[PDB]
Amino acid sequence: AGDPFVDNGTVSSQRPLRAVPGRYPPGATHLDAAVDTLVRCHAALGRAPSEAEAAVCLLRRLWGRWGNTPVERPGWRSYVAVDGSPFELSAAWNGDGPAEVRVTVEATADPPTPEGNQEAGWEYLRGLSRHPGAATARVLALEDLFRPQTPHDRCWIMHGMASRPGADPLFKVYLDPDARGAAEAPSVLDEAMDRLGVRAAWQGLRGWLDEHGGSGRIGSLALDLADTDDARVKVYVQHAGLDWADIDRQAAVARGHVPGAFSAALEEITGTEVPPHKPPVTCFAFHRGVGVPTAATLYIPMPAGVPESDARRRSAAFMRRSGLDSAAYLAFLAAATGDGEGVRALQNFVAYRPAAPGGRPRFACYVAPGLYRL
Ligand SMILES: CC(C)[C@H]1C(=O)N[C@H](CO)Cc2c[nH]c3cccc(c23)N1C
Numbered sequence: 357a358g359d360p361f362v363d364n365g366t367v368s369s370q371r372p373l374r375a376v377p378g379r380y381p382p383g384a385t386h387l388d389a390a391v392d393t394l395v396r397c398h399a400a401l402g403r404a405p406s407e408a409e410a411a412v413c414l415l416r417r418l419w420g421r422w423g424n425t426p427v428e429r430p431g432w433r434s435y436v437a438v439d440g441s442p443f444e445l446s447a448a449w450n451g452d453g454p455a456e457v458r459v460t461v462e463a464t465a466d467p468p469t470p471e472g473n474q475e476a477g478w479e480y481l482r483g484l485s486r487h488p489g490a491a492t493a494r495v496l497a498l499e500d501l502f503r504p505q506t507p508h509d510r511c512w513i514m515h516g517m518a519s520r521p522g523a524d525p526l527f528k529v530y531l532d533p534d535a536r537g538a539a540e541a542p543s544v545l546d547e548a549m550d551r552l553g554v555r556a557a558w559q560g561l562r563g564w565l566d567e568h569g570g571s572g573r574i575g576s577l578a579l580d581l582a583d584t585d586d587a588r589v590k591v592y593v594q595h596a597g598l599d600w601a602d603i604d605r606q607a608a609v610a611r612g613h614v615p616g617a618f619s620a621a622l623e624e625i626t627g628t629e630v631p632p633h634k635p636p637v638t639c640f641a642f643h644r645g646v647g648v649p650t651a652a653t654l655y656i657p658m659p660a661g662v663p664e665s666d667a668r669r670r671s672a673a674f675m676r677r678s679g680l681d682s683a684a685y686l687a688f689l690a691a692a693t694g695d696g697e698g699v700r701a702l703q704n705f706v707a708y709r710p711a712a713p714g715g716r717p718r719f720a721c722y723v724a725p726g727l728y729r730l
Pocket residue numbers: 359361362435436437444460530575576592594634637655704705722
């Protein structure tokens with residue numbers, strides 16, 4: 357159970373995790389690092405300082421109980437960031453204008469154990485249920501599926517908080533399809549999609565995938581925790597063993613598909629010379645009452661056999677050619693990592709959704725803070 361391409365779980369001789377020098381002071385907590393990084397990233401994107409301050413207050417309120425753990429000698433290697441930190445920074449560009457800043461976190465127990473962490477992860481949602489801008493009913497209605505009495509050793513649940521320019525924050529949750537083991541994943545997903553009122557579209561997607569190259573591995577079921585028409589159910593499909601043209605064709609089931617956009621993005625960033633260390637992932641979005649996915653967003657891994665500096669160059673160039681603010685992307689990477697030189701592979705994926713008629717191109721980055729050696 358758990359992601360076969362990256363690692364997470366209890367730290368030990370078999371899963372080592374060592375803090376890098378030159379980042380935060382020796383007694384610093386993950387929350388200290390996250391608050392500072394969040395502020396720096398808002399500045400790098402030219403966002404309002406008052407909005408940064410609000411984002412910090414929100415982070416402390418919702419996650420401070422769990423995130424105030426020492427950076428040095430960690431007991432758990434999280435899934436949320438590629439360096440194993442329990443938080444990850446992200447920026448999202450939806451057409452022109454200031455980017456959204458997002459932080460995604462995991463709540464760990466003291467001391468961190470599968471049972472304790474899973475408890476903390478769902479305790480987080482009880483805290484969130486008290487926040488007026490959050491709608492947690494849809495995820496709490498899934499707790500008996502995703503929170504077994506005995507979690508697996510690599511259990512995870514991730515929580516996102518989005519800081520939006522001139523707007524209220526948005527909250528998101530990412531659930532582990534393997535919560536009850538790999539064998540139970542299909543059943544868990546099926547039941548969850550039933551409960552969320554999107555069976556038709558989900559079963560439709562399942563059928564479609566099986567006739568266009570195979571489903572792959574379901575990486576997460578995620579929910580927008582809002583009671584608006586904009587809220588979606590999201591399923592992440594990890595495309596192990598599929599070529600770029602096939603990933604592109606698989607997206608045709610979703611509204612807004614632009615033939616060739618996904619495969620061009622993959623060629624321009626991941627390349628066609630060496631398989632990437634982990635496969636690309638498509639996020640299919642769903643809405644109750646719609647019989648097909650409403651959108652498909654591609655998560656593009658960095659190229660294998662290519663330096664990180666070149667991976668950043670390719671990503672920035674792709675952004676520009678898409679019309680988006682590549683200067684802001686590079687600045688954000690520097691702020692999030694302290695690695696302006698671009699020598700550390702701290703990106704998770706970059707994400708892309710092409711502009712459909714009447715819409716805007718979208719790009720997003722996801723970057724670990726580089727508190728730990730890779
Ligand atoms: C399950 C997806 C959301 C996920 C994924 O397939 N793999 C990541 C590790 O390679 C997990 C992950 C952690 N933080 C993320 C931020 C954006 C996308 C991610 C992730 N994946 C595409």
